[PDB]
Amino acid sequence: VRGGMRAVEFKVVETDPSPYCIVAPDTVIHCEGEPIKREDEEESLNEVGYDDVGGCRKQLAQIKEMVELPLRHPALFKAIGVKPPRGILLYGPPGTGKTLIARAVANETGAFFFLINGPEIMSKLAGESESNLRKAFEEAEKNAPAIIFIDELDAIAPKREKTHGEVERRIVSQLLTLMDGLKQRAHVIVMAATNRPNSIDPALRRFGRFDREVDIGIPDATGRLEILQIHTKNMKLADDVDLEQVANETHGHVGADLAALCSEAALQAIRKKMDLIDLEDETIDAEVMNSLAVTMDDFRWALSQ
Amino acid sequence: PNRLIVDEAINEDNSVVSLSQPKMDELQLFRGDTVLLKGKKRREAVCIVLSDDTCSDEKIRMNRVVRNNLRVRLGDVISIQPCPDVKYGKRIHVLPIDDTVEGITGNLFEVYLKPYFLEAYRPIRKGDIFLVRGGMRAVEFKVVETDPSPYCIVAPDTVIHCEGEPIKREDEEESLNEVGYDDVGGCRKQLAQIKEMVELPLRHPALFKAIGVKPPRGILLYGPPGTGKTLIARAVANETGAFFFLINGPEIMSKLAGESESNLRKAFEEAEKNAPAIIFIDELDAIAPKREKTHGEVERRIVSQLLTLMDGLKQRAHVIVMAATNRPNSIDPALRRFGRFDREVDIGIPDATGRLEILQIHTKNMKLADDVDLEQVANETHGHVGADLAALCSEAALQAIRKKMDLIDLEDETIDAEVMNSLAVTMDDFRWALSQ
Amino acid sequence: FTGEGQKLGSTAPQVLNTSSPAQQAENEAKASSSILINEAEPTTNIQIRLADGGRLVQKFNHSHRISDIRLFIVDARPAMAATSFVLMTTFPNKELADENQTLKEANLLNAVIVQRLT
Ligand SMILES: Nc1ncnc2c1ncn2[C@@H]1O[C@H](COP(=O)(O)OP(=O)(O)O)[C@@H](O)[C@H]1O
Ligand SMILES: Nc1ncnc2c1ncn2[C@@H]1O[C@H](COP(=O)(O)OP(=O)(O)O)[C@@H](O)[C@H]1O
C-alpha cells in the first residue's frame, strides 16, 4: 500500500471464511498492534524491479533476452556448444539508469548481484584493487547464476591514451584477464556502464569480453513521463498536477534528474505546510504525511531551480 | 493567537523586535509597547515592538542577541504578549563575560554601558545577555540583577552597577562573536537558497526517517577567492545549530599518502557522529581536480576516496557536505555526478549595494567619523570582494591607530578601552587604505 | 458484557437468506425460465455478485438490459425486491447507471456484475 510518501507491506495473517475471502464493505478488519518479521524467501517490494525503470523498453527488452537463457536456463549451456553473451556494455550519460537496470535484471531473474564501483576500486592501493577485482569474480562464480556490475568502468579502464602508470594499466590488465578466464559453465554475466565507447580501453571489447553493447540514452518526453509517474507513486499529487507538462519542459534531464526533481517538489510541499502547521516532532505521523499533497506549483518551483 | 515564526532582523538594535502592522492589530500592540517573548527552556526576554512592512504576518523579526536569550534559532516559534507592567527600574547589576573583555582594561561603564543605555529606555530582563560594540570589539554583558525583578526599563535615573570580576560562559551560551547570517552581506538570493536547502535535513532530521524523499547532500559553492564561502558554510552551521567540521584542501594534500585518505574518512566519521552536521571542504579544487589535472598515483586515489565517501553517505546520517571552489571547471566532473555534489550555488563579486553592507559589517565595532561615507568607499571598490573590503577596513583602522595612538602614546600600558573608544577612523584613513 | 457483538458500521443494513433452502431453487427456476432466450440471436453471459453473502448466479441472452438483470435478481430472490441497491463492474468500479442501457452499450458482455445495497 502506497501513500504518505512511502509504501507499507502487509501480510494477511488470517481471513474469516478461511483460505481466501473478498474484502467486502462489511468485512471486519483487524490490524492489532505488532509488525511481523520478513522471512527469507520473501523479497521486499522495495527491491528494484522492471517496474521501476521507465523510458527503456527497447533496451530493457534486448537485455532481457540476452540474459534470459544464461541466467534462467543455465543447464542449457551445460549441454550446449553455443556461446551465450558474457559481457554487456551499457553506455549513456550519468543518471540514465544503468546501475538501476543491472540491479533490476538481477533481482527479476533471481540472480546473484555483485557490485564493483570504479572509484571504490581506484581509491585502493594497486595490489588491493586487483585483489578486489578477482574477489568479485570469485564470489560471483560461487553463487551463480550471477551478474557482476562494474559501475563507472571508465574510471578503471580509460581509453588507450589516458594510461598514466604501472598501476593504472596494471588494473585494467587484471580486469581483461578476469574476463578471458570467465568460462560459460560459470553462468556469469558481467555488465559494465560507461558514458560512451571512446571512454573505455578498446581491448575490453575484444570478442570474448564486452562484445555486446546497449545504448541507454536520455529519455524522450514519453519516456520522461514514465519516470515521473514512477517517482511519485508513493505520494499524493494535487489534482492540478500535470506530469506530462512537467516532462515537456524537461528535455535533457535524465532519470536521476527527474527523481531529484520530484524530491524537491515534495520537500517544497512539506516546507510550506510543515513549517507553520506544527507538524514537526522526533517522529512522524503517518496521517500527517498522508494528507500532504504536492501541487503543480511545487513542480513549477522545483523546475525554476 | 500569539505564536509566531522567528525570522531575521531588519533593525539590528538589540532591544527591538518587529512584526507586520496587521499582526500588531490582532495582538492590540502599538508602535513602542514593550513586549514579553517566550522561547525554549523556560526562557523569556523583554523587547520593544515596532512595525515592518517587509515582515510576514506570521513571523517576527529579531536579532541573534534576543534569539539567543530565548534559546531559539531562526525558524522556531515563540509566544509574544504585551508587557504593560514593566517599571522604570532602580538599580541594575551587570557583569561582562571574561572572553569578551580579555586584554582590555579600564572603565567598561563609561566606555560601554553608559553610551548603550543612554536615553534609550532599553527594557531588560534578569539573565539576559546583551552586546555592546565599541573600542574595536564587542563586549557581552549578563544582567545578573534588576531591582524590580525580573525585568525593568533602564531609565536615565536607573543605577547601573558593574561590581566584580567577569563571569564564565555557560556551555549553552553561544558567543555572539560566532559567525551568523548577520555577518554575511550581499548574498541575499544565495543565502536564501542555501537555507531552504538545509532547512529540513538540518532542522527536521526525524523527518527523513519516515519519508522516502531524498534531501540534498552535497552543495557546491562557486566564486572567486574571498567571496565568503567559508563564512557562509560556517554561519549556516552555527545558525542551524549543526555541528560544523572543516576540511581544508591543502591541509589534506600536505599529508603523506594514505594519511591523506585516512583524514578524509575520519572527517566524515566524526561528522556522522555529531549529526546534524555540515562538512565543509575548503578549497576542493586542491583535492579534487581531474581529467587533465593529473593521475599522479596519489592525487587520483585521493579524489577517488572523496567520491567514495560521497556515495557512502545516506540520509540516515543527517549530514550535509558543502564544498567551495573558484569555478566548476576546476573540480572533477565526477563530483557533480548525481548522488554527490548535486546542488550548486554561485556566489560572485558583490554589487554596490552588497559592498556597502559588507563595509557596514566590518566597522560595527569601530568609531567611524561623521566624514566617513561608506557609500563613497562602496562606490569605488567595484571589482573588490568581501575579503578585500574587510582587509580595507583593517588597514584604515591600523592607519588611524598609527596616527593618533602610536605617537602621542609611545608609552605602554594603554590597553585601556577608553583610549580605543576615543580613537576615531576618519574618511581620510579609508582614503589612504584605498591608495594601497 | 458477555462477548460477541457486531459493530454498528455506516454500511447499509444486510439482507440474509429469506428464502428457505427449497425456496431458492424455485427462485432460480423462475429467473432461469422467466425471461426470453431466442436462440437465433447471439448470446452473452452474466455473473451476479450479490451481497447476500457472496452469492453468484449466471446466465442470459443476446441483447437485453441492465434493468432486466435487476429484474432477474428480484425474480431469483424475493427479499431484495424491497431492498434498494445498485450494480457495478469492479476495478474501474463503474456504477451501472441508466438502468435501461443495453448490455452492448455498457461493455457488459460476458462480464461480472457486482451488487451493492445502498
Ligand atoms: N530510466 C529510469 N527510470 C526511472 N528512474 C530512473 C531511471 N534512470 C535513473 N533513475 C533514477 O535515478 C537514479 C540514477 O541511478 P543509476 O542507475 O545509478 O544511474 P547511472 O548508473 O545511469 O549513473 C536511480 O536510482 C533512479 O531512482
Ligand atoms: N559576504 C561577506 N560579507 C561580509 N564579509 C565578508 C563577506 N565575504 C567575505 N567576507 C570577509 O572576507 C573573509 C573571506 O572569507 P572566506 O569565507 O574564507 O572566503 P572564501 O571562502 O570565499 O575564500 C571573511 O572571513 C570575511 O571577514
Curated annotation (Swiss-Prot), chain A:
GO terms for biological process: aggresome assembly; ATP metabolic process; autophagosome maturation; autophagy; cellular response to arsenite ion; cellular response to heat; cellular response to misfolded protein; cytoplasm protein quality control. Keywords: Acetylation, ATP-binding, Autophagy, Cytoplasm, DNA damage, DNA repair, Endoplasmic reticulum, Hydrolase, Isopeptide bond, Lipid-binding, Methylation, Nucleotide-binding, Nucleus, Phosphoprotein, Transport, Ubl conjugation, Ubl conjugation pathway. GO terms for molecular function: ADP binding; ATP binding; ATP hydrolysis activity; BAT3 complex binding; deubiquitinase activator activity; identical protein binding; K48-linked polyubiquitin modification-dependent protein binding; lipid binding. It is found in: Cytoplasm, Cytosol; Endoplasmic reticulum; Nucleus; Cytoplasm, Stress granule. It comes from the Eukaryota. One of its GO terms (cellular component) is nucleoplasm. The modification Phosphothreonine is found at T283. Phosphorylated by tyrosine kinases in response to T-cell antigen receptor activation. Phosphorylated in mitotic cells. ISGylated. ATP 1 binds at P94, G95, T96, G97, K98, T99, L100, N195, H231. The N-terminal domain shows evolutionary conservation with that of PEX1, and is able to bind phospholipids with a preference for phosphatidylinositol mono- and bisphosphates. The PIM (PUB-interaction motif) motif mediates interaction with the PUB domain of RNF31. This is Transitional endoplasmic reticulum ATPase. It comes from Mus musculus.
Curated annotation (Swiss-Prot), chain C:
The keyword Cell membrane does not apply. It is found in: Nucleus; Golgi apparatus, Golgi stack; Chromosome; Cytoplasm, Cytoskeleton, Microtubule organizing center, Centrosome. The modification Phosphoserine is found at S20. Phosphorylated during mitosis. Phosphorylation inhibits interaction with Golgi membranes and is required for the fragmentation of the Golgi stacks during mitosis. It comes from the Eukaryota. Reduces the ATPase activity of VCP. Necessary for the fragmentation of Golgi stacks during mitosis and for VCP-mediated reassembly of Golgi stacks after mitosis. May play a role in VCP-mediated formation of transitional endoplasmic reticulum (tER). Inhibits the activity of CTSL (in vitro). Together with UBXN2B/p37, regulates the centrosomal levels of kinase AURKA/Aurora A during mitotic progression by promoting AURKA removal from centrosomes in prophase. Also, regulates spindle orientation during mitosis. It comes from Rattus norvegicus. One of its GO terms (cellular component) is spindle pole centrosome. Part of a ternary complex containing STX5A, NSFL1C and VCP. NSFL1C forms a homotrimer that binds to one end of a VCP homohexamer. The complex binds to membranes enriched in phosphatidylethanolamine-containing lipids and promotes Golgi membrane fusion. Interaction with VCIP135 leads to dissociation of the complex via ATP hydrolysis by VCP. Binds ubiquitin and mono-ubiquitinated proteins via its N-terminal UBA-like domain when bound to VCP. Changing R49A: Reduced interaction with VCP. Residues 39-116 form the UBX domain. Keywords: Chromosome, Cytoplasm, Cytoskeleton, Golgi apparatus, Lipid-binding, Nucleus, Phosphoprotein. Belongs to the NSFL1C family. One of its GO terms (molecular function) is ATPase binding. GO terms for biological process: autophagosome assembly; establishment of mitotic spindle orientation; Golgi organization; membrane fusion; negative regulation of protein localization to centrosome; nuclear membrane reassembly; positive regulation of mitotic centrosome separation; proteasome-mediated ubiquitin-dependent protein catabolic process. Coiled coil: none annotated. Highly expressed in heart, brain, spleen, lung, liver, muscle, kidney and testis. The chain holds residues 253 to 370 of 370 of the full protein. This is NSFL1 cofactor p47. The keyword Signal does not apply.
